[PDB]
Subunit: 288 residues, 2 copies
């Protein structure tokens, strides 16, 4: 076929990523830890972060083989964060994607350890499976992944989110600070690691970072819009529409997507798939 079909693009990339994730975890002694990591890693989902990494790598002149190990590592980090998030000490969720959570299947101890194992493996896998990368670029990917996961990124965001729970003084600024850390850091890492592997300039990286921060926040604002309008069709937690109103929330979500698209215009037409992904993810949230 000759016509770019975004749904098909995303389906093909998801298939490549899921085959690589499956192959990445060969069961060995002790089999339980591999089974528990695979239970969460291979559970499906959109695979957005690996897809963003591959797509940004290609945009900057790299190839899928260069990006794929780091793409897998990003999904291992994402997966670890969900395993830890679901625990009884954290969100205490029995189900995820309509299936029992890792700790409800294997125990809290095994779930904690499966998350730790996935986070360690992300770093190992980037190095062992990208021997063709420029070594200084690969070291920059490792530094970015460490910074992204830790107290200045995802883990800091998880702490900011826990601190907000049940508070009565939440503002839009407080929510945005949570989101930039809890989801924005890892979305930024997904596009920036792909770009770094391909040798992108600082200027190119700054445009991709603006794209990633904007789509991350837009996705959160849209999720809040759909939550409050489902409640319209039907503990206390403030949301963008509860704090700002639905009109202002809708205008902010649209502005953020528009700014993400404008951020990538200077790449030229090569940026069209990343620009399309921004609008597509939002449109699918409204349809699903």
């Amino acid at each position: 076929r000759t016509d770019f079909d975004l749904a098909q693009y995303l389906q093909v990339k998801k298939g490549v990523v899921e085959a690589a994730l499956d192959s990445s975890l060969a069961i060995a002694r002790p089999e339980k830890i591999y089974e528990a990591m695979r239970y969460s890693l291979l559970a499906g989902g959109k695979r957005l972060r690996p897809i963003l990494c591959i797509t940004a790598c290609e945009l900057c002149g790299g190839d899928e083989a260069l990006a794929l190990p780091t793409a897998c590592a990003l999904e291992m980090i994402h997966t670890m964060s969900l395993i830890h998030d679901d625990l009884p000490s954290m969100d205490n969720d029995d189900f995820r994607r309509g299936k029992p959570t890792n700790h409800k299947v294997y125990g809290e101890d095994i779930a904690i350890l499966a998350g730790d194992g996935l986070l360690a493996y992300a770093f190992e896998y980037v190095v062992t499976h990208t021997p063709q990368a420029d070594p200084q670029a690969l070291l920059q990917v490792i530094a970015r992944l460490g910074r992204t996961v830790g107290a200045a990124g995802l883990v800091g965001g998880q702490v900011l989110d826990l601190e907000s729970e049940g508070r009565t003084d939440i503002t839009p600024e407080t929510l945005t600070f949570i989101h930039t850390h809890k989801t924005g850091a890892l979305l930024e890492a997904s596009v920036l690691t792909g770009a770094i592997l391909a040798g992108a300039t600082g200027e190119q990286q700054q445009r991709l970072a603006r794209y990633a921060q904007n789509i991350g926040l837009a996705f959160q604002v849209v999720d809040d819009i759909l939550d409050i309008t489902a409640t319209q069709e039907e503990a206390q937690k403030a949301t963008y529409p509860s704090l700002l109103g639905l009109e202002a929330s809708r205008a902010q979500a649209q502005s953020l997507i528009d700014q993400a698209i404008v951020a990538l215009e200077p790449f030229g037409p090569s940026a069209e798939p990343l620009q399309a992904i921004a609008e597509y993810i939002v449109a699918r949230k409204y349809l699903e």
Copy 2:
């Protein structure tokens, strides 16, 4: 002073390591996560793994400045492992080194996350603070650290240790398999990362791996001897072998560790002495 004094050597290396760990974590928002990571990282202790890393790097022709960031990363990883091990889902310890455990101070949620934050920071720190390393050697250190922590190392060891509880078929070989994963991988990583940074040969690295595996197992045998002589169900070296055979095995392992490093010449004397010193202090701190 002209006499090599191991205790003084260790005190000076511990002071360098502790100053670097303290400087590594500047409090920022959210303050609680930095407070929780600092609480466990800066709790003191022997700092064995960072000191092994610096000592092995120096043995192989490297220096403290080359090794120090990796040494700090090893102690961040060690610290994470203890935070997670203490949790109510795992050992459920209220105290460590006579002080409240991380989750008793900050809560289980913050403790889990402080562990995750320390493991992430280990990899960041190694890369950002070692610009003078050969980049391929530094990548080999990163791969070694990730393999050491995960399913083929420490986390696999933690799972093998849980699986051993309340079993009747544990053998000395099965117990040794637990220990080589749960503590041996990280002790081996401590000396091998220092050696890799310095450009050690494969032959040198194989000797340091033998040293590390032997001291790690000796430390575990000695811990079991001291526990049973002070006295969830778990077999131990003395419960499986008897005390006489356990004592002979602990001595043999220390002897083998010392012999493993003889071919380096007198430069290996500090590492050789650390093996005997750690055992001697365990008996004295019993």
